[PDB]
From Swiss-Prot, chain B:
Coiled coil residues, start to end: none
Keyword Lyase included in the entry's annotation: yes
Name of this protein: 2-oxo-4-hydroxy-4-carboxy-5-ureidoimidazoline decarboxylase
Role: Catalyzes the stereoselective decarboxylation of 2-oxo-4-hydroxy-4-carboxy-5-ureidoimidazoline (OHCU) to (S)-allantoin.
Origin species: Danio rerio (Zebrafish)
Membrane-spanning intervals of the chain: none
Main localisation: other
Cellular compartments per GO CC: peroxisome
Signal peptide: none
The keyword Lyase appears for this protein: yes
Enzyme Commission number(s) from the entry: 4.1.1.97
GO BP annotations, alphabetical order: allantoin metabolic process; purine nucleobase metabolic process; urate catabolic process
Gene name as annotated: urad
Catalytic activity: 5-hydroxy-2-oxo-4-ureido-2,5-dihydro-1H-imidazole-5-carboxylate + H(+) = (S)-allantoin + CO2
């Protein structure tokens, strides 16, 4: 109900919406300045607009706040609740020993090339399509890749918003 | 040693500096793109330029990431390590019931007016200093107070950076 959302104290808005962009409560906190919102689509558009206003370093910064697929945080149970549910849904918590080693190698190569983690909308992908995209995007130019990765962040945000 | 800092992977850079601006690891993560840093002043400068580049809503957002002095998070024991240390130095952890309620009322007034929390560099202020600032800053226009509060965020950041050092 957008009416209840529109009446929220910023403290409660930030609590509810503070992880729609992974570990970036600043973004959701910022857009509360634009209330009242017409609907959830309005919130979505405002978030997208905010992200796009950032310098490229800000965009790379958002990416760097994300955990690796199947990496150290998954393995040690220190993912955010949303990342945990997304990674598990995409097959990341039932990978076999060879599958884990492979994801480590791919992630390593990606972060070395681009200087930020591999981000994908896990809810919209399975194991196989994730491996495929990791390899494909590895071939991209930095400028094109940053755009690709931020689009994934926006898809994740949209799904998280609609889960609240 | 600025050379050790300059050689950090982004994951380690974000782990170490991710809370120099409260609950805003994005800021530390962004500035890593501008490495190598000439010195600590270069890091601070880059942080300041980044914040300065945000829309006003981004600046308000940063402020909204900060917890209230003597507020729910202090009482519940859920502050970040740096905030817990800072609020303790400023006398916020040894308040009596009257004082805790007084702080709640002052914060409620400020946040109602401005639409973000009252932020002050707690390491440079005592309990009485805080109450005085809480009352004087309440008089400010919103345009001016946002600028004032962001200046305090940068002071907090500077001290957080110096404590890592």
């Amino acid at each position: 109900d957008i009416n209840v959302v529109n009446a929220l104290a910023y403290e409660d808005f930030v609590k509810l919406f503070g992880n729609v962009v992974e570990k970036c409560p600043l973004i959701s906190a910022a857009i509360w300045s634009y209330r009242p919102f017409k609907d959830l689509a309005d919130i979505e558009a405002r978030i997208s607009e905010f992200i796009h206003s950032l310098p490229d370093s800000g965009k790379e910064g958002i990416l760097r706040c994300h955990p690796d697929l199947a990496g150290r945080d998954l393995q040690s149970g220190t993912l955010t609740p949303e990342s945990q549910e997304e990674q598990s849904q995409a097959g990341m918590t039932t990978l076999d020993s060879a599958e884990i080693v492979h994801m480590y190698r791919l992630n390593s190569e990606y972060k070395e090339r681009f200087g930020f983690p591999f981000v994908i909308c896990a809810r919209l992908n399975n194991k196989a399509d994730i491996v495929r995209q990791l390899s494909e995007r590895l071939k991209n130019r930095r400028t094109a890749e940053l755009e690709c990765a931020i689009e994934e962040v926006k898809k994740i945000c949209s799904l998280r918003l609609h889960s609240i």
